[PDB]
Amino acid sequence: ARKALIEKAKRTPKFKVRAYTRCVRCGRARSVYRFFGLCRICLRELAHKGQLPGVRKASW
Amino acid sequence: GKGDRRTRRGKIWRGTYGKYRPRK
Amino acid sequence: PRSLKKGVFVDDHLLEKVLELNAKGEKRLIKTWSRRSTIVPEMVGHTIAVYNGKQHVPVYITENMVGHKLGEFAPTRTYR
Amino acid sequence: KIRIKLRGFDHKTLDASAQKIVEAARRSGAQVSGPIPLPTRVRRFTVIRGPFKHKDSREHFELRTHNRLVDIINPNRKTIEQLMTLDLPTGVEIEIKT
Amino acid sequence: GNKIHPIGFRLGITRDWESRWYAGKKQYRHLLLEDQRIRGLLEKELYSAGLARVDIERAADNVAVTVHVAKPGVVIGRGGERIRVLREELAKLTGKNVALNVQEVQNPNLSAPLVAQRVAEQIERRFAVRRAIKQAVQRVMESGAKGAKVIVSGRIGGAEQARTEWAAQGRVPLHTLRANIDYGFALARTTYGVLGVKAYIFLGEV
Amino acid sequence: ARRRRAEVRQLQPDLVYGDVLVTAFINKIMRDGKKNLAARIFYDACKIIQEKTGQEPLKVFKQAVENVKPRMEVRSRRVGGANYQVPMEVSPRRQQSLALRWLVQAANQRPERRAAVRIAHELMDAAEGKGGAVKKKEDVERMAEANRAYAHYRW
Amino acid sequence: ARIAGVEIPRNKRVDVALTYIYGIGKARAKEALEKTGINPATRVKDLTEAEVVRLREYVENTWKLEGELRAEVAANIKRLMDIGCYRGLRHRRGLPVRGQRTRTNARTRKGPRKTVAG
Amino acid sequence: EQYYGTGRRKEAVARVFLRPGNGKVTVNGQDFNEYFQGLVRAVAALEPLRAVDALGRFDAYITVRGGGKSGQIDAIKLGIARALVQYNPDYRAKLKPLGFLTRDARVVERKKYGKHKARRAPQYSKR
RNA sequence: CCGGGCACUCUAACGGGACUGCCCGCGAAAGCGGGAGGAAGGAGGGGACGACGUCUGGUCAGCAUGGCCCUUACGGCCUGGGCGACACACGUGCUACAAUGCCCACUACAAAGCGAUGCCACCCGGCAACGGGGAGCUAAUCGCAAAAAGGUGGGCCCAGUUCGGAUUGGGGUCUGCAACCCGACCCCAUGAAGCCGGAAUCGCUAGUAAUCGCGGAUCAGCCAUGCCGCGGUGAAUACG
Ligand SMILES: [Mg+2]
Ligand SMILES: [Mg+2]
Ligand SMILES: [Mg+2]
Ligand SMILES: [Mg+2]
Ligand SMILES: [Mg+2]
Ligand SMILES: [Mg+2]
Ligand SMILES: [Mg+2]
Ligand SMILES: [Mg+2]
Ligand SMILES: [Mg+2]
Ligand SMILES: [Mg+2]
Ligand SMILES: [Mg+2]
Ligand SMILES: [Zn+2]
The missing domain is CATH 3.30.300.20 (K homology (KH) domain)
Incomplete structure (x- = not known):
């Protein structure tokens, strides 16, 4: 996203309401997971790399 | 029917509880 | 069916400034921005110009409408 | 009785170091309760393959966290010796409470 | 794709x-x-x-x-x-x-992450792509490997219009799990434009 | 079915008469996949035949079916212009299906409220010799033999 | 009989027949059929000139149904209008009120479609 | 005095114990015709016995847990066929023709993406 | 439920098993047809997996990135509005138009998941949502949970009607600094179009379609009938 809009990490937003994850790396606000603090993209990126332990390619 | 709010299945579907769907 | 609850809300901004105009007797027009702010008896007579998002609309309050909210009287959009 | 809950991300690494914390406790004490598996708690992920539109793709990712027990009989006081802190694996995290 | x-x-x-x-x-x-x-x-x-x-x-x-x-x-x-x-x-x-x-x-030339780095380095230094490629392929195929392959992105030679340079020898199956092939990606910024380089090196087997 | 002549997937016998025809019928009756109530509906009517016959239920059934199955039905065949309505003998397999399907169909076409009544009174009209069942039947044969002028466009 | 202002349910069940009343629904029934104890499932035809009275007196003078009701509601709307209330508006301009999408599906409030040369 | 044939189905396991008894077949502390109250089929489960002229000349106590009444109706029909042979082996002989001894592999398929359910695929237009 | 015990179910690792290997028929062979054994038979059933390349495909609003353009505004903070407008048009869906159904009571089996400021048992007040009080759990051992359809019983009796819940008036709870614009949920009243859909058109070949309900992600709350998974019952038909 823009740069200003990366102040989310502002401990004092004013009200816990404005607390929006926003991907850590890309900053991708949408598709952001919790268990990873990542957007559906960066997720699948590293996943394929292998920098996320236990995280395998689901099959069943 | 499966969509009438003030009824039995109306809650079962709308996913709720009320005077029309208590517990025990 | 408007659910405020068991603890009404009114953004102080004017609450204080409107409650004070009563001390001098009355005033002459105001102008809120918290159209979200409910309404109380101490309005009757006043004139709180609310924002539409573009302008400051003079909403002449009245007994009948004392229970409503500023916003319902400041029309947002335009059409025909 | 010694509660040992071995939980790792892989069925080998972990499971392996859970056939150790027994031998080193099969002589110095009760023949143990053998290592008990316990079902796995899986965290599943699915994400639109590419970015922008194309929502009819997805690809799937899991995260199986296996479990293990073992459990023994009477803190032999002399078993803790063969065990104590002679570990070695790093892809595990077992907690305790006998 | x-x-x-x-x-x-x-x-x-x-x-x-x-x-x-x-x-x-x-x-x-x-x-x-x-x-x-x-x-x-x-x-x-x-x-x-x-x-x-x-x-x-x-x-x-x-x-x-x-x-x-x-x-x-x-x-x-x-x-x-x-x-x-x-x-x-x-x-x-x-x-x-x-x-x-x-x-x-x-052998830094079996480590894909590198083999590619090199091909990138070269390219970033105004080198001859297809040449460097046919080389790296060798630097890699010419030392143990059962097969390798290199892939340079687009804007080859600086070309005003994207292209894609191939090159590769010996088995490099991918649809086969039992493969084992180091994959190495290499970014490669440039005066006129970016362009990655992939590096695949099939080795061993079972 | 471009590959092979699909097999006439046999079906399990009836939980009573141990018949297959009967089953097939229950199957046609059932909807939304509720073999239960259906087993009933049909069975419940297998009885109603009695209150109106000293006859046996099964026979009545066999007769209703073996009576509504057609012999020659229409069939299109476009040829260098417009599509013609051609006849032709009818398959021993398309017999059954085309019949049952019609029974359970004509049944649900009646005024009777209690579902089982319908089917029940329907097999009867059927086995007997009239009603919407044999209607749609003797209404197809009549369709062919009305275009029997295309015995040259066989197959 | 003629319970609420001029009523006439008959031949049917009662917990059903009362329904045919304005301020009466499948709810205010059981209540009245209890606050006045009556075997619910009785054909109104088979009603006691004695129960019809308790039933009437209760329902009539216990609520605000029929005629008098139709006027209250209309009164709130008519009121809603008198003041520049948003809601008081959508009513004037035949359009959904409770915050709904007026683009697609809006028929019920708007009625028949007025298809125009697009 | 005792026999145990299993029989699973669509995720339904049935422990089928067989005892020489006169034939008082029953399930989870609930009469057979009482766990399968008005379920046309059910009877099926016993077909195996009914098939070996048994039925009345043999008693059965059975368990079951998992799946749906039906599935159980099937699983059970299996154990009752398994232990039934776990008893007399020369029993397969003509118990196999019908095959009341063959884990019904047919199991619910998965839900693939971009669909509504394995096969049921979204409909479209202007094409 | 406590002692007791791993035989069974299961939980989860590891192997075993099926190869046209066996018998008949045909063939030059591959292999095709049929039969026995067998849990399964000829790729047993479903996934992950998509070749050189094509469409100058999509995305410089994910991220990276060559050039260009603005640097007191094409940057930045904020508050209110907007993304939610409406005379209409199309797409994908949901709920129906009913008696193989709807309603109340009682009663019976699932699988996969989630739970720290979180899942909330049990008791209490309230018609209710929910509020107050409060046990256990870091969770095969406690909670979300009830599965629903189904089964035994009784209600309606073919009616826009006990079908159908749109729309609108009124009262109220929970999240949040704040629900006018613009949230969901409950109780009451309201009870609309709709009685199976023109021309045309979509999906699916077996545990599939059809049908029933359960969880999850995101997330204070929610506009999820959507998306992604689970399992219950369980068909028709394929000449060609
Ligand atoms: Mg950026
Ligand atoms: Mg938020
Ligand atoms: Mg209804
Ligand atoms: Mg999508
Ligand atoms: Mg879609
Ligand atoms: Mg392959
Ligand atoms: Mg293009
Ligand atoms: Mg474009
Ligand atoms: Mg939008
Ligand atoms: Mg009406
Ligand atoms: Mg009708
Ligand atoms: Zn990312």
Whole structure:
């Protein structure tokens, strides 16, 4: 996203309401997971790399 | 029917509880 | 069916400034921005110009409408 | 009785170091309760393959966290010796409470 | 378009995750960004070395930030004049204080992450793509490998219009898990424009 | 079915008469996949035949069926212009299906409220010799033999 | 009989027949059929000139149904209008009130479609 | 005095114990015709016995847990066929023709993406 | 439920098993047809997996990135509005138009998941949502949970009607600094179009379609009938 809009990490937003994850790396606000603090993209990126332990390619 | 709010299945579907769907 | 609850809300901004105009007797027009702010008896007579998002609309309050909210009287959009 | 809950991300690494914390406790004490598996708690992920539109793709990712027990009989006081802190694996995290 | 990252497609088998440490819960989202910051600045420097893999291990405080390279004698700096300043920058990240026990890589031309780096380096230096390629292929196919392959992106030669240069020899099956093929990506910025370079090196088998 | 002549997937016998025809019928009756109530509906009517016959239920059934199955039905065949309505003998398999399907169909076409009544009174009209069942039947044969002028466009 | 202002349910069940009343629904029934104890499932035809009275007196003078009701509601709307209330508006301009999408599906409030040359 | 044939089905396991008894077949502390109250089929489960002229000349106590009444109706029909042979082996002989001894592999398929359910695929237009 | 015990179910690792290997028929062979054994038979059933390349495909609003353009505004903070407008048009869906159904009471089996400021047992007040009080759990051992359809019983009796819940008036709870614009949920009243859909058109070949309900992600709350998974019952038909 823009740069200003990366102040989310502002401990004092004013009200816990404005607390929006926003991907850590890309900053991708949408598709952001919790268990990873990542957007559906960066997720699948590293996943394929292998920098996320236990995280395998689901099959069943 | 499966969509009438003030009824039995109306809650079962709308996913709720009320005077029309208590517990025990 | 408007659910405020068991603890009404009114953004102080004017609450204080409107409650004070009563001390001098009355005033002459105001102008809120918290159209979200409910309404109380101490309005009757006043004139709180609310924002539409573009302008400051003079909403002449009245007994009948004392229970409503500023916003319902400041029309947002335009059409025909 | 010694509660040992071995939980790792892989069925080998972990499971392996859970056939150790027994031998080193099969002589110095009760023949143990053998290592008990316990079902796995899986965290599943699915994400639109590419970015922008194309929502009819997805690809799937899991995260199986296996479990293990073992459990023994009477803190032999002399078993803790063969065990104590002679570990070695790093892809595990077992907690305790006998 | 068709295809995957055989690496992420082989983790189940022929490939152990970069970071091999159980944990999770209210920590995974943490002990994760950890590595990122690690292998993050960790690349900003060791570029000159052959920074291939960079495993990571944990279990309790005492981490294990390894690092492979083809230029170990570079990591060290001077008996310990470098391998120190850096293990210090570690407390500016992992306050959890960790090692750094380095290791080395045999033949920097089988380490895909590098083979590609090189082809990139070359290219970034205004080199002859298709030539460098047919070379790297050899630098790699010409040392043990059962098969390799290199792929340079577009804007070849600077061409005002994207292209794609191939080249590769010997078996390089990918639809086969039992494969084991180091995959190496290499970015390669340029005066006129970016352009990655992929590196595939099929070795061993079963 | 471009590959092979699909097999006439046999069906399990009836939980009573142990018949297959009967089953098939129950199957046609059932909807939304509720073999239960259907087993009933039909069975419940297998009885109603009695209150109106000293006859046996099964026979009545067999007769209703073996009576509504057609012999020659229409069939299109466009040829260098417009599509003609051609006849032709009828398959021993398309007999059954085309019949049952019509019974359970004509049944649900009646005024009777209690579902089972319908089917029940329907098999009867059927086995007997009239009603919507044999209607749609003797209404197809009549369709062919009305275009029997295309015995040259066989197959 | 003629319970609420001029009523006429008959031949049917009662907990059903009362329904045919304005301020009466499948709810205010059971209540009245209890606050006045009556075997619910009885054909109104088979009603006691004695119960019809308690039933009437209750329902009539216990609520605000029929005629008098139709006027109250209309009164709130008519009121809603008098003041520049948003809601008081959508009513004037035949359009959904409770915050709904007036683009697609809006028929019920708007009625028949007025298809125009697009 | 005792026999045990299993029989699973669509995720339904049935422990089928067989005892020489006169034939008081029953399930989870609930009469057979009482766990399968008005379920046309059910009877099926016993077909195996009914098939070996048994039925009345043999008693059965059975368990079951998992799946749906039906599935159980089937699983049970299996154990009752399994232990039934776990008893007399020369029993398969003509118990196999019908095959009341063959784990019904047919199991619910998965839900693939971009669909509504394995096969049921979204409909479209202007094409 | 406590002692007791791993035989069974299961939980989860590891192997075993099936190869046209066996018998008949045909063939030059591959292999095709049929039969026995067998849990399964000829790729047993479903996934992950998509070749050289094509469409100058999509995305410089994910991220990276060559050039260009603005640097007191094409940057930045904020508050209110907007993304939610409406005379209409199309797409994908949901709920129906009913008696193989709807309603109340009682009663019976699932699988996969989630749970720290979180799942909330049990008791209490309230018609209710929910509020107050409060046990256990870091969770095969406690909670979300009830599965629903189904089964035994009784209600309606073919009616726009006990079908159908749109729309609108009124009262109220929970999240949040704040629900006018613009949230969901409950109780009451309201009870609309709709009685099976023109020309045309979509899906699916077996545990599938059809049908019933359960969880999850995101997330304070929610506009999820959507998306992604689970399992219950369980067909028709394929000449060609
Ligand atoms: Mg940026
Ligand atoms: Mg938020
Ligand atoms: Mg209804
Ligand atoms: Mg999507
Ligand atoms: Mg879609
Ligand atoms: Mg393949
Ligand atoms: Mg283009
Ligand atoms: Mg474009
Ligand atoms: Mg929008
Ligand atoms: Mg009406
Ligand atoms: Mg009708
Ligand atoms: Zn990312």
